[PDB]
Amino acid sequence: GYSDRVRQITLGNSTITTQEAANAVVAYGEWPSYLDDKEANPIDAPTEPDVSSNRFYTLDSVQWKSTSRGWWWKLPDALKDMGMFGQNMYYHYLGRSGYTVHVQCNASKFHQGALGVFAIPEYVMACNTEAKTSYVSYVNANPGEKGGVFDNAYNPSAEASEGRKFAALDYLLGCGVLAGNAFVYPHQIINLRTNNSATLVLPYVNSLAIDCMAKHNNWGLVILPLCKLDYAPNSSTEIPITVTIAPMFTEFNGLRNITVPATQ
Amino acid sequence: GAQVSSQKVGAHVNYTTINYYKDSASNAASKLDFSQDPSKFTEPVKDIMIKTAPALN
């Protein structure tokens, strides 16, 4: 009865089902967990919001078309305005979190296409001016739930002030490495003939036990069309990709007044 | 007369010392001494002060 294709995930008051999964990835073979006393750093009693924040949040959907070059998000950035997770994140100097990432994309037995879904620790991307290096604005680096898109062309700005965004060049993974090697990162593939979802469970990954969530994204989430969407009756058809992410084992330290980041 | 002692740990465990000279002044650095008693400077009071109690009663 039980199948690698059929799965239920419940976190807090939220449940996901899928009937065409392909197993699930646990990044680096490690389930998330709370921070042990023998690895702890800040000494204040932490806030552990549990079910209020450790639950599935569904981002705005994006549209996959035959011309799409791909999508990226950063974490915890993508969830910064998500319910109580966002509130706990911004009321504290420090936070850590694992995640269940569930990417959703159904079609039909007559559609074809394949998405690579990658979770990338420290997903540092190139800037879009050659007058400077490492020259990206906070606002452009942290788009929130809307994320960003890849392009298949690199056109750096004439003036430094106009190029303070990522040069998200698809085949270089936006960072000067070949995209074909992205499989060294925890990943699944949504190949429409086989599956309609990808599930990745991510532990906290950093060189520290806990860090400033508003300064630092621990993971990038990359969705790249490896094989383009095609549908014979209408080559210009679009199918949604929906990203749903639950924080897990969240823990926060250094409570004060709320952080309100710059918006321009 | 070789002395075998613990090294200070690095990124990722013993070492050997032999003294070659007849004067102790010739020796390498004294071994780590973790002794301390801050209270001779931070609390040099005649009558014991219990933190949880009033300092002046």
């Binding site: - | 973790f34 931070t42 009071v45 949880t52």
Partner: peptide, 27 residues
């Protein structure tokens, strides 16, 4: 020998007042 570890503690509502002292003592 290490520097001081921090114990697990919660709150108090008590006649024990370690937050107050008198540095006139020389402590």
């Amino acid at each position: 020998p290490t520097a001081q570890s921090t114990p697990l503690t919660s709150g108090v509502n008590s006649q024990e007042v370690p937050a107050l002292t008198a540095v006139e003592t020389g402590a």
